Design a protein around this ligand. Structure first.
Ligand SMILES: CCCCCCCCCCCCCCCCCC(=O)OC[C@H](COP(=O)([O-])OCC(O)COP(=O)([O-])OC[C@@H](COC(=O)CCCCCCCCCCCCCCCCC)OC(=O)CCCCCCCCCCCCCCCCC)OC(=O)CCCCCCCCCCCCCCCCC
Ligand SMILES: CCCCCCCCCCCCCCCCCC(=O)OC[C@H](COP(=O)([O-])OCC[N+](C)(C)C)OC(=O)CCCCCCCCCCCCCCCCC
Ligand SMILES: CCCCCCCCCCCCCCCCCC(=O)OC[C@H](COP(=O)([O-])OCC[N+](C)(C)C)OC(=O)CCCCCCCCCCCCCCCCC
Ligand SMILES: CCCCCCCCCCCCCCCCCCCC(=O)O[C@H](COC(=O)CCCCCCCCCCCCCC)COP(=O)(O)OCCN
Ligand code: HEM
Ligand code: HEM
Ligand SMILES: CCCCCCCCCCCCCC(=O)OC[C@H](COP(=O)([O-])O)OC(=O)CCCCCCCCCCCCC
Ligand SMILES: CCCCCCCCCCCCO[C@@H]1O[C@H](CO)[C@@H](O[C@H]2O[C@H](CO)[C@@H](O)[C@H](O)[C@H]2O)[C@H](O)[C@H]1O
Ligand SMILES: CCCCCCCCCCCCO[C@@H]1O[C@H](CO)[C@@H](O[C@H]2O[C@H](CO)[C@@H](O)[C@H](O)[C@H]2O)[C@H](O)[C@H]1O
Ligand SMILES: CCCCCCCCCCC1=C(C)C(=O)C(OC)=C(OC)C1=O
Lengths: 438, 383, 59, 54, 75, 124
């Protein structure tokens, strides 16, 4: 039984949430923000990611070089990431270097220079990033998957933004973005590891007390996405491995089907030919794929956002003449979530997940990421006892009912990259979303 | 690349008749497949020829067959060739099926060619039954009457189906003209299924008398089996010659030289010899519907050989007990044949019932028992 | 023209109500009607055609 | 619409059952409808229209 | 403390087990109905089908009770 | 029937003194009359191989055993097509009739049957 997550607020509306671990000697403090690329429009798309670069480019006090030195002298590191709905800025340090790290984070968020000279310098760095993501095939696949699933909608936009915007982002629009979005009621100061809650609340009162509050404070994790069944094919005969993602519209964080969708995902599960145990996994799809050498790997996912989600699978394969079989067998295993699953598969997946949701939290950064994610999506940290109860409530009837409304005979978003000549056209893939025998 | 391999059409022929890789040790019982192909070719050539001179109308049918015998140049030959080759076709098909059962040709991975084979056998029965009616002699008519009346046993709709098949209320002109049309068609359907069972076979290749893999030692189909097939072709043609030229009516019934008469019933209505075992099985069951089911089951039960044979070894070459049981099964099948043409009199009635029980118990009891025990004897015996 | 994340314009073709049960049901109504007339047409065809084998008027 | 989809369309067994039952109904009703229509456009011409004289 | 995972093997045959088959029982039902409706529809023209089945259905059954007038029947 | 089944049943018989007393002499005569040794085969050479499980067991044979099996199959095929029997050293002596394949197939089947059982497990 893990120690209790303590939670306090300040007056501005900033939440402080902490989970102490007296067994470790390091601490991860950071700021989780309920804001990301989705908050941009089409003209300033790329701003949030642009800011992340400039946050480390110098503040009103410390210059770029002073910033570098200050963190070097702390001993730990700082890290940041911008997603579609979430921005994180954290600092891993020693136990007694926590006040330094909170102070540096507060500085780079509130008091950043955003000097025209640095805007102009990063504008090239970011331009080069456009031509080097091209190599990260999983990311290429998932960015096209969001683009097509949420065609011409905010969730469909990339984080980097178009080249055109990168050339026209000004310090004015950067300032406007962080002034509108980085507000106290959207922010959570999180500490995990060797942190005292009461110490952290004092440091928050010292550094984050002059944060703007938004005019209309909605609860944390407050958002209409219209999924488009569609396909992007990026054929490249010169690549040896085909990467394919298939997804349907999934569930939001606060859906009543959130756990049901995770159990369904666990029934298909993951597979990787490089891992020794994977040939022995209980998952039917795993067995088919490993026996027939259909794939190097597959990874089921159930991605959630505030008001929608994508649920699907990501496949990689060198077997370019049996991509048809790979996709066929995958979708026929999804069919069985609607037609065939019983207590046998459901209880096995529940067992696996009851541990899996706890196992994931194995270091201070993972714990902080869990506190931060849950506080910015659900407004509270859900205790493992509540999670165990919600999982226990998922029955075979629930999974069948969910799959029959979410998967069965539904439109898919499909992205194929690489030697995908053998991937059939949209209709033949989508026809595998039902079984004529049922 | 050689043209025979490069060109897709030539390559299909090549894959079946020239480069086809065969076991190097097929014995003479592997020659019935090509004899069956020969019978089928003879029946197509003679049958199409008879159709040029035969008239299907009941007022003219029997006389058109006499016109063939008497006036058409070599009509007697074409007619007797067609009639006798129908019997040879069944000798070859029983031999071919016997080979398949003794050497375990029905076992995995050859369940599919065997299952299609069972349908080929049913198509041959229907083809030959309809062709026999076409003569419209006494056996033609009365045979059609009794065999088509078995359909009346189908519950509820049986009588309606019989009248539908006949196209009237008894066997007559409508029945004869439809049997002509179907008799012409059925051999083409049969040739398609014969081709399908070969294509299905080509995935595993031919089995062989030892029951082991031949993947270690293959011979081209040509010239080795081409020239080996010629020997049995000439042996077959000698047997054909002795019947067709010297004894053309030995395998037939004299009553079929009397024109069909719906009034006079022949002394004894029996099927052609090759249907006799199935007729004995039918007589064994007292119930009409029971008898029909038993008769059909006697053929469809061949479909379960892949299941009931529990042996870890393919075929009987090395299984002395299975060989003895096979010997008894075959002799019983010939006894059933004989009992199919005796009168329904003591003591043949009870004997027919015992033989019928033995026929079914081979599939359902004896082969599963014997094959189980021999598995254990091979294992303990060779420890 | 260059970015592959900017999806081409499909607005001339996209239905707003594409994810609704009504939307799917309509297309299945068309498929089902077509299957229904094909079933009724096949039944009529088979029945009329095979009746040639029942006793003719002269019999 | 959801209800209708769920009952008659979602399972192909149910969809095929619905199609066949509709084909049965269509076949019977269409027969009757055409019979009446044919008799109205050809009124007074058919045997059934003159039969009463004999 | 748990020393062993807690499970049993359910009876199975040719890769079928009772939990799974039970989920398909209703589907066999509907397919049986589909086959029934289809079969009956195919033989609706058969006179015995009308005489024995279809004409006996209440209300609807009069659709299949049709007499040719004796004046119009050569046979 | 599976090799597993055959081997288990045989072990039940070999356990029972009465049963072994009456079965073992029969089995030995059966094997002598079977006559596979007269074509230079070992018993295990006759087991049907066109099955996924048996293909896997054959792939797991040590190379030497594998090469010798190929030779026995080819030699027996030559005796079959010639209508001759083995003579001299080509005849399999009872002491040479070793179950070289049984251990491999029993392992392959053990896994295959455990996999089937575990595919039907029910969390209690
Ligand atoms: C009809 C159309 C005419 C066409 C004729 C085709 C028939 C040819 C054929 O398949 O049989 C020939 C066939 C010879 O074929 P083979 O390829 O030399 O050997 C096949 C046997 O597996 C080999 O069997 P085996 O080597 O053990 O030899 C056994 C055979 C001896 O076979 C010899 O020919 C010698 O003798 C007997 O089994 C006779 C039984 C004793 C009676 C007393 O004759 C037999 O062996 C008949 C045995 C059946 C009982
Ligand atoms: C009559 C009874 C037949 C008994 C046959 C027993 C085996 C035998 O001696 O045959 C010789 C041979 C023995 O051949 P073999 O292949 O077992 O052995 C060759 C010799 N050794 C073992 C040294 C390699 O058997 C055949 O060739 C059998 C073919 C069967 C064809 C039967 C046709 C009957 C039709 C009924 C259809 C239903
Ligand atoms: C000629 C005979 C035609 C008879 C068709 C009668 C019923 C079959 C039918 O309409 O098929 C629809 C069905 C279903 O069409 P479908 O495959 O587009 O629908 C599947 C998706 N659900 C079940 C969710 C609606 O097709 C078949 O079952 C194939 C048979 C057609 C031949
Ligand atoms: C009357 C029917 C038989 C007469 C035809 C046989 C061929 C006559 C002599 C010709 C001959 O022997 O030469 C070979 C031709 O045979 C061939 O090319 C054919 C070989 C055997 C002829 C028929 C094959 C039968 C196999 C299946 C029977 C099917 C029955 C179904 C209807 C070529 O000699 P070579 O090619 O060996 O090489 C040798 C170098 N060129
Ligand atoms: C018109 C009838 C048929 C023709 C022309 C025909 C022809 C052939 C030919 C050419 C072969 C390959 C050579 C051989 O083994 O003899 C063959 C193999 C085979 N046939 Fe037939 N056949 C016929 C009917 C049947 C029937 C009725 C059955 C089964 C009931 C059958 C089952 C098989 C099987 C199982 C094989 C593979 C046997 C093996 O090689 O091990 N066939 N057939
Ligand atoms: C598997 C092929 C065939 C078999 C087993 C077969 C069998 C028979 C039989 C048993 C008869 C009765 C013969 C008699 O006693 O006179 C017959 C007659 C006849 N068959 Fe076939 N037949 C076959 C193929 C064909 C084909 C392809 C035709 C093409 C029309 C045909 C046309 C005829 C005709 C016209 C008669 C009646 C004249 C007569 O009795 O000789 N047959 N057939
Ligand atoms: C009129 C047309 C008739 C079409 C009939 C189609 C019936 C197909 C039924 C079927 O596939 O049942 C599968 C079920 C076992 O499920 P699973 O093991 O395939 O998931 O199998 C069993 O339960 C046994
Ligand atoms: C027996 C009557 C003679 C006519 C032949 C029968 C006509 C129907 C045959 C075509 C059906 C397809 O049959 C299929 O053809 C291809 C090429 O031809 C064969 O393919 C085989 O031969 C070719 C080269 O010869 C190889 O590339 C291939 O590895 C091999 O499997 C199949 O083994 C056979 O199953
Ligand atoms: C696997 C398929 C199942 C078996 C198929 C059944 C085969 C035969 C079925 C019925 C055929 C005869 O069934 C009969 O058909 C004819 C039309 O064809 C119908 O006859 C109806 O239409 C015809 C013309 O269309 C008119 O001349 C007639 O006056 C009218 O009654 C009969 O009302 C019906 O009793
Ligand atoms: C129209 C369809 C008829 C199919 C049969 C035609 C082929 C002619 C027989 C040749 C033959 C084949 C194919 C064959 O595969 C084979 O090896 C087992 C034979 O000889 C032992 C054969 O004789």
């Amino acid at each position: 039984v893990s120690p209790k997550t303590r939670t306090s607020n300040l007056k501005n509306g900033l939440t402080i949430a902490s989970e102490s671990n007296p067994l470790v000697q390091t601490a991860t403090v950071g700021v989780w923000i309920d804001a990301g690329s989705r908050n941009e429009n089409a003209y300033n798309n790329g701003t949030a990611h642009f800011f992340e670069h400039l946050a480390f480019k110098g503040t009103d006090k410390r210059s770029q070089h002073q910033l570098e030195l200050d963190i070097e002298n702390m001993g730990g590191h700082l890290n940041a990431y911008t997603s579609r709905e979430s921005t994180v800025y954290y600092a891993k340090s020693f136990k007694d270097d926590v006040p330094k790290s909170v102070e540096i984070l507060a500085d780079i968020l509130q008091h950043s220079k955003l000097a025209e000279s640095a805007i102009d310098r990063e504008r090239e760095v970011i331009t080069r990033e456009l031509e080097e993501v091209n190599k990260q095939y999983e990311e290429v696949v998932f960015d096209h998957l969001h683009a097509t699933a949420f065609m011409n909608q905010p969730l469909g936009r990339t984080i980097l933004g178009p080249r055109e915007n990168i050339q026209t982002i000004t310090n004015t629009e950067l300032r406007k973005f962080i002034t509108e979005n980085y507000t106290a009621d959207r922010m959570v100061l999180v500490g995990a590891g060797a942190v005292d809650h009461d110490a952290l609340v004092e440091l928050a009162e010292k550094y984050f007390s002059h944060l703007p509050s938004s005019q209309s404070p909605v609860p944390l994790g407050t958002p209409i996405p219209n999924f488009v069944g569609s396909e992007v094919r990026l054929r490249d005969d010169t690549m040896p491995v085909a990467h394919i993602a298939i997804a349907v519209e999934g569930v939001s964080w606060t859906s009543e089907d959130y756990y049901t969708a995770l159990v369904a995902q666990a029934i298909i599960g993951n597979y990787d030919r490089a891992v020794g145990t994977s040939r022995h996994q209980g998952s039917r799809l795993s067995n088919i794929v490993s026996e027939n050498n259909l794939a190097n790997s597959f990874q089921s996912f159930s991605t959630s956002y505030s008001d929608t989600g994508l649920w699907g699978i990501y496949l990689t394969s060198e077997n370019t003449t049996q991509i048809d079989d790979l996709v066929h067998f995958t979708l026929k295993e999804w069919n069985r979530l609607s037609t065939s699953v019983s207590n046998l598969q459901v209880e096995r997946a529940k067992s696996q997940l009851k541990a899996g949701l706890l196992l994931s939290l194995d270091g201070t950064t993972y714990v902080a990421e869990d506190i931060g994610r849950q506080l910015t999506t659900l407004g509270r940290r859900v205790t493992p006892a509540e999670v165990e109860a919600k999982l226990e409530a998922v029955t075979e009837h629930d999974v069948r009912a969910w799959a029959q409304k979410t998967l069965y005979d539904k439109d898919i978003a499909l992205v194929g990259l690489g030697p995908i000549e053998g991937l059939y056209d949209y209709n033949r893939i989508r026809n595998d979303m039902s079984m004529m025998r049922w | 690349m050689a043209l025979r391999k490069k060109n897709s059409l030539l390559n299909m022929a090549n894959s079946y008749v020239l480069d086809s890789p065969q076991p190097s040790n097929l014995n003479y019982f592997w020659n019935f497949g090509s004899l069956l192909a020969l019978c089928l070719v003879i029946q197509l050539a003679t049958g199409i020829t008879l159709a040029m001179h035969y008239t299907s109308h009941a007022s003219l049918a029997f006389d058109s067959v006499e016109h063939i015998m008497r006036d058409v140049n070599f009509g007697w030959f074409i007619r007797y060739a067609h009639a006798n080759t129908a019997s040879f076709f069944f000798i070859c098909i029983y031999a071919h099926m016997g080979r398949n059962i003794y050497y375990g040709s029905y076992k995995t991975p050859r369940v599919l060619p065997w299952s299609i084979g069972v349908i080929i056998f049913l198509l041959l029965i229907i083809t030959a039954f309809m062709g026999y009616v076409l003569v419209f002699g006494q056996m033609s008519l009365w045979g059609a009457t009794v065999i088509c009346n078995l359909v009346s046993a189908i519950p509820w709709l049986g009588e309606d189906i019989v009248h539908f098949l006949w196209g009237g209320f008894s066997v007559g002109n409508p029945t004869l003209q439809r049997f002509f049309a179907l008799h012409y068609l059925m051999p083409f359907v049969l040739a398609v299924f014969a081709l399908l069972h070969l294509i299905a076979l080509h995935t595993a290749g031919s089995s062989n008398p030892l029951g082991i893999t031949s993947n270690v030692d293959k011979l081209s189909m040509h010239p080795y089996y081409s020239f080996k097939d010629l020997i049995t072709v000439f042996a077959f043609l000698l047997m054909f010659t002795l019947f067709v030229f010297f004894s053309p009516d030995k395998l037939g019934h004299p009553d079929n030289y009397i024109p069909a008469n719906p009034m006079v019933t022949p002394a004894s209505i029996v099927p052609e010899w090759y249907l006799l075992p199935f007729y004995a099985i039918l007589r064994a069951i007292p119930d009409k519907l029971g008898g029909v089911i038993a008769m059909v089951a006697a053929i469809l039960i061949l479909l379960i050989l892949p299941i009931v044979d529990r042996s870890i070894i393919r075929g009987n070459a090395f299984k002395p007990i299975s060989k003895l049981l096979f010997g008894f099964f075959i002799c019983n099948f010939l006894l059933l044949g004989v009992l199919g043409q005796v009168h329904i009199e003591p003591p043949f009635i009870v004997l027919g019932q015992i033989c019928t029980i033995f026929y079914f118990s081979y599939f359902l009891i004896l082969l599963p028992m014997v094959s189980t025990i021999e598995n254990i004897f091979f294992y303990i015996g060779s420890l | 023209g260059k970015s592959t994340y900017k999806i081409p314009d499909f607005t001339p073709y996209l239905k707003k109500d594409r994810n609704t049960d009504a939307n799917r049901l309509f297309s299945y109504f068309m498929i089902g009607s077509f299957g229904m007339l094909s079933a009724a047409g096949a039944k009529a065809t088979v029945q009329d055609f095979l009746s040639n084998m029942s006793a003719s008027a002269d019999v | 619409a959801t209800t209708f989809y769920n009952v008659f369309v979602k399972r192909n067994s149910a969809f095929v059952a619905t199609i066949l039952a509709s084909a049965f109904v269509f076949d019977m009703t269409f027969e009757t409808a055409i019979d009446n229509f044919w008799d109205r456009i050809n009124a007074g011409k058919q045997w059934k229209d003159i039969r009463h004289k004999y | 403390y748990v020393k062993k995972p807690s499970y049993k093997i359910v009876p199975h045959f040719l890769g079928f087990n009772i939990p799974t088959v039970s989920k398909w029982i209703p589907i066999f039902g509907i397919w049986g109905a589909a086959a029934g409706i289809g079969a009956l529809f195919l033989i609706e023209g058969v006179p015995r089908t009308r005489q024995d089945i279809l004409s006996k259905i209440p209300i609807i059954g009069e659709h299949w009770i049709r007499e040719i007038p004796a004046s119009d029947n050569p046979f | 029937a599976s090799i597993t089944s055959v081997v288990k049943t045989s072990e039940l018989i070999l356990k029972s003194p009465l049963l072994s007393k009456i079965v073992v002499p029969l089995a030995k005569t059966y094997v002598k009359f079977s006559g596979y040794r007269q074509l230079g085969f070992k018993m295990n050479d006759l087991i049907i191989e066109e099955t996924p499980n048996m293909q896997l067991a054959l792939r797991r044979l040590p190379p030497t055993e594998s090469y010798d099996r190929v030779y026995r199959l080819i030699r027996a095929t030559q005796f079959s097509l010639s209508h001759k029997l083995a003579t001299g050293n080509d005849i399999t002596k009872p002491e040479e009739d070793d179950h070289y394949l049984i251990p491999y197939i029993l392992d392959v089947e053990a896994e295959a049957f455990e996999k089937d059982a575990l595919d039907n497990l029910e969390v209690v």
